[PDB]
Design a protein around this nucleic acid. Structure first.
Ligand SMILES: [K+]
Ligand SMILES: [K+]
Ligand SMILES: [K+]
Ligand SMILES: [K+]
Ligand SMILES: [K+]
Ligand SMILES: [K+]
Ligand SMILES: [K+]
Ligand SMILES: [K+]
Ligand SMILES: [K+]
Ligand SMILES: [K+]
Ligand SMILES: [K+]
Ligand SMILES: [K+]
Ligand SMILES: [K+]
Ligand SMILES: [K+]
Ligand SMILES: [K+]
Ligand SMILES: [K+]
Ligand SMILES: [K+]
Ligand SMILES: [K+]
Ligand SMILES: [K+]
Ligand SMILES: [K+]
Ligand SMILES: [K+]
Ligand SMILES: [K+]
Ligand SMILES: [K+]
Ligand SMILES: [K+]
Ligand SMILES: [Mg+2]
Ligand SMILES: [Mg+2]
Ligand SMILES: [Mg+2]
Ligand SMILES: [Mg+2]
Ligand SMILES: [Mg+2]
Ligand SMILES: [Mg+2]
Ligand SMILES: [Mg+2]
Ligand SMILES: [Mg+2]
Ligand SMILES: [Mg+2]
Ligand SMILES: [Mg+2]
Lengths: 65, 94, 139, 378
RNA sequence: ACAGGACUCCGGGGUCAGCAGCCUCUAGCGCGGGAGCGAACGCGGCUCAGGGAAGUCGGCAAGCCGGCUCCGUAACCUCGG
RNA sequence: CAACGAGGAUCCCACUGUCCCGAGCCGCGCCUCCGCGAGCCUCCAGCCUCGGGAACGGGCGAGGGCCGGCCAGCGGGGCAAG
RNA sequence: GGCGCGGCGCCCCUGUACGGCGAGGGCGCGUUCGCCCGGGGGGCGCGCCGCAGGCGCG
């Protein structure tokens, strides 16, 4: 089934899950769950949040194709 | 007689009770659970058990205790000092 | 002959986030800065219940003291295009914006402004095709 | 004086009294009407509420705003292991309503049915149907009592029991229920059909069909003793009320000098016998089929049981039916399902593209354990 | 007979501006009794999406503000604020 | 009339469960049990509708209802008590 | 309705355990950092098993 990619973490989002948010510079953000949305709004750094795709890429655990 | 070895989960026994009473209700739960382990009518605890149960105040009791139960005559219960309770269960000797 | 009303078609019920007494941003370029919402059109009420509106609804406003003198002191029709209360679309998507916002618009369907700033919602764009035309982004 | 502003009353007085249900389970009050000439069918079945999920479906309405678009819908999964037909009852329409003729039982009866006859099974000494099995060993007797039913009874029902050793449930005795045989050409054809069913199993797929509509009957969730604000939905009084704002302020005028039955008061809330109607069937299938919940859209294999299991229910290992929407009761109550007496007239057909199988224990993001392990490899 | 009323001595440590609040050494340890359950309702508390006084006679109640350092401070005035 | 006020008033900002519209949680009562154990009040009694009547009856005329014994709540009556 | 107690596995929640070894502004000390390590801890849901489980009245 077609999915989405969480914009804060890197996970995939299944149909009927999460919530979107429309920024005022005409940009859409798709969140996996409330935890991810709270992290984003509080402005915590994705690199420093250790369970994220960005953090794993910057620690070398994931690959940058 | 017989010697039993058994762990009791204490956070599970103080569930649904006010936390200002956790250690006394843990004492009463341990006696009831030992009676329905060893099939006796009277259970003499040991101050080693009492010290272990109270070791963190009246509110925040330890999760797990390990008991040695010597059945005789009553049941006499003492504290067995173990680590991490990994894959331990009921042991019976005698 | 042709004297048709404003709202084009049917719209499904969504969550209503703005009750009477709310203040919202002016999204067009008429000169107004804040709009005070005093009534909702098509509203049948109930005892003690405040009238409430969602995106796509026509509301009645008054222009606040930070807006132009010539627009003030009058009751004006408007349409809400941006909402912070999160709502569910029929396809299963939940969505919300960062601010609350509307444009000044008559029930015939013509804007009193020439531009709209920021995104608008599919609800407003589908009921009002002039909004759908002059909008710069639709979510 | 008159009430100055107009406002309706709170709550529906046609659901009185608000007492706990005394019926044991949901009991089917009425059956769908018999149509002389219709093909034969059964009308009712009994399942156990298992869970909820959501599906994606392509809508083919007409004139609607969802005409050529996709919608996400809630669905409820009910688990229905096959039932066993054990007896036949006939009734007659008399100046005093429906009166029964006789009940003919099967020659050999199963353990769950025997168990429903007793309170504690291991202790009670077993003398149910002790003479009946001996007498009815030869089938001639059943032939003649069937002859009596054929001769004169006006409606036919079969008496069938569920089978709980095929569920995660805790009980061991069956739930016993009558399913009425409707349709056919005459009475005697219905009696012949009931004889052919006697002692066999019956699947829900041979009662209900996909896209049709049903009625669900069960007993609601219980909440115990509750006040008026929650039990009736009356307004809460102001903050500076001296002794509590969770009340009705006035419970009657001076005259008449009694409290009326239309005034809201406190008491038992929940655990009532209810009926929701016009539920559309999304599917009937089986859990032994590992392809049951797999659409042409997705290539991995999926089945009914979610990753982690059905929360607070258990594992479904047999047949299931899946309806649009919701239904009364918590997980694990027995639900009666019957045909819809007055169905809704414009319901677009069923066309499923995806079913959610991800974990409901928490916020599970993996459709299957295999791809969870691939994602968490090493 | 009793959460009331009833003058005065002596006055350690830590945080701190401190005889404030909070924790404590020395000394002392009653308070008409216990157990179980975890309904309504009440009494003392806590948190709540979106809106923000539309509530009410009335912003009653609650909440916002608050230490220290630097910046920057109007009308009016009995020239002291 | 500056300064001052637990003094009476109108308005704005900020703030909020005051409210739209309510929901969940904690402790202690309540509840059940072992021990202890009172006050107020009381013509006699305690189900209604109409009539007549000291012009608004529990008892009176005529109708309609109803085994008996209790609990948790509740505030319409007892023209409830003081 | 011979319950349960106690384990094991899955699945979720939080967010990478103690320790060990090797970067760190600086002057043997050093807040903090990287690796072992989506780790450690926890469970009131799901699945399968040591101690056990069917009481006196009437
Ligand atoms: K809003
Ligand atoms: K009135
Ligand atoms: K009134
Ligand atoms: K009320
Ligand atoms: K009344
Ligand atoms: K009533
Ligand atoms: K009422
Ligand atoms: K009440
Ligand atoms: K009903
Ligand atoms: K209780
Ligand atoms: K109550
Ligand atoms: K006000
Ligand atoms: K009002
Ligand atoms: K106030
Ligand atoms: K300030
Ligand atoms: K002065
Ligand atoms: K003064
Ligand atoms: K004063
Ligand atoms: K005054
Ligand atoms: K509540
Ligand atoms: K009269
Ligand atoms: K009268
Ligand atoms: K009263
Ligand atoms: K009266
Ligand atoms: Mg009102
Ligand atoms: Mg008072
Ligand atoms: Mg869930
Ligand atoms: Mg007002
Ligand atoms: Mg003074
Ligand atoms: Mg609410
Ligand atoms: Mg009287
Ligand atoms: Mg009489
Ligand atoms: Mg009164
Ligand atoms: Mg580490």
């Amino acid at each position: 089934v077609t999915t989405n990619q969480c914009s804060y973490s890197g996970r995939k989002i299944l149909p009927g899950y999460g919530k979107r948010m429309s920024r005022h510079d005409k940009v859409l953000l798709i969140f996996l769950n409330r935890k991810a949305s709270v992290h984003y709004l509080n402005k915590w750094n994705p690199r420093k949040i250790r369970w994220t795709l960005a953090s794993r890429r910057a620690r070398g655990k994931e690959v940058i194709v | 007689g017989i010697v039993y070895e058994h762990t009791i989960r204490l956070n599970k026994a103080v569930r649904g009770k006010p936390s200002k009473k956790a250690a006394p209700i843990a004492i009463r739960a341990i006696r009831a659970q030992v009676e329905k382990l060893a099939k006796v009518e009277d259970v003499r605890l040991d101050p080693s058990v009492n010290v272990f149960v109270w070791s963190r105040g009246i509110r925040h009791v330890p999760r797990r205790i390990r008991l040695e139960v010597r059945l005789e005559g009553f049941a006499y219960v003492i504290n067995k000092d173990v680590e991490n309770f990994k894959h331990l269960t009921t042991e019976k000797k005698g | 002959k042709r004297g048709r009303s404003g709202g084009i078609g049917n719209k499904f019920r969504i969550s209503c986030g703005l009750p009477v007494g709310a203040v919202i941003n002016c999204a067009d370029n008429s000169g107004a800065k804040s709009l005070n919402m005093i009534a909702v059109k098509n509203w049948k009420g109930h005892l003690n219940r405040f009238p409430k509106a969602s995106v796509g609804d026509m509301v009645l406003i008054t222009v606040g003291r930070d807006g132009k003198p010539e627009l003030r002191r009058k009751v004006t029709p408007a349409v809400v295009v941006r909402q912070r209360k999160v709502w569910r679309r029929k396809d299963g998507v939940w969505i919300y914006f960062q601010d609350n916002a509307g444009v000044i618009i008559n029930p015939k369907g013509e804007l009193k402004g020439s531009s709209i700033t920021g995104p608008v919602a599919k609800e407003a764009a589908d009921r009002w095709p002039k909004i759908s035309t002059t909008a710069e982004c639709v979510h | 004086s008159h009430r100055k502003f107009s406002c309706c009353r709170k709550g529906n007085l046609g659901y009185l009294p608000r007492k706990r249900c005394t019926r044991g389970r949901g009991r089917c009050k009425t059956f769908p009407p018999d149509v002389q000439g219709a093909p034969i069918h059964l009308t009712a079945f009994l399942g156990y509420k298992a869970g909820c999920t959501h599906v994606m479906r392509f809508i083919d309405h007409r004139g609607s705003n969802l005409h050529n678009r996709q919608a996400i819908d809630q669905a409820t999964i009910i688990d229905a292991p096959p039932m066993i037909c054990t007896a036949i009852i006939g009734y007659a329409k008399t100046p005093k309503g429906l009166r029964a003729v006789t009940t003919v039982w099967a020659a050999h009866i199963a353990e769950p049915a025997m168990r429903r006859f007793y309170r504690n099974y291991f202790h009670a000494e077993k003398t149910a149907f002790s003479t009946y099995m001996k007498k009815a060993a030869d089938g001639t007797y059943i032939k003649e009592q069937l002859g009596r039913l054929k001769q004169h009874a006006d409606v036919i029902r079969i008496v069938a029991h569920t089978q709980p050793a095929l569920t995660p449930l805790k009980q061991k005795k069956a739930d016993i229920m009558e399913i009425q045989v409707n349709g056919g050409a005459n009475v005697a054809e219905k009696v012949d059909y009931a004889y052919a069913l006697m002692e066999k199993p019956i699947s829900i797929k041979d009662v209900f069909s996909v896209g049709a509509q049903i009625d669900t009957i069960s007993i609601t969730r219980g909440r115990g003793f509750e006040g008026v604000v929650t039990r009736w939905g009356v307004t809460r009084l102001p903050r500076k009320t001296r002794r509590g704002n969770r009340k009705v302020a006035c419970i009657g005028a001076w005259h008449p000098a009694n409290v009326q039955y239309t005034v809201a008061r406190a008491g038992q809330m929940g655990y009532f016998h209810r009926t929701d109607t016009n539920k559309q069937v999304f599917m009937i299938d089986t859990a032994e089929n590992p392809r049951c919940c797999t659409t042409e859209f997705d290539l991995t294999d999926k089945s009914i049981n979610p990753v982690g299991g059905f929360v607070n229910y258990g594992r479904v290992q047999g047949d299931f039916i899946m309806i649009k929407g919701t239904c009364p009761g918590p997980k694990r109550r027995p639900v009666v399902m019957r045909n819809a007496l007055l169905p809704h007239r414009n319901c677009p057909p069923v066309q499923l593209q995806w079913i959610s199988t991800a974990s409901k224990f928490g916020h599970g993001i993996f459709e299957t354990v295999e791809e969870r392990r691939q994602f968490y490899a090493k």
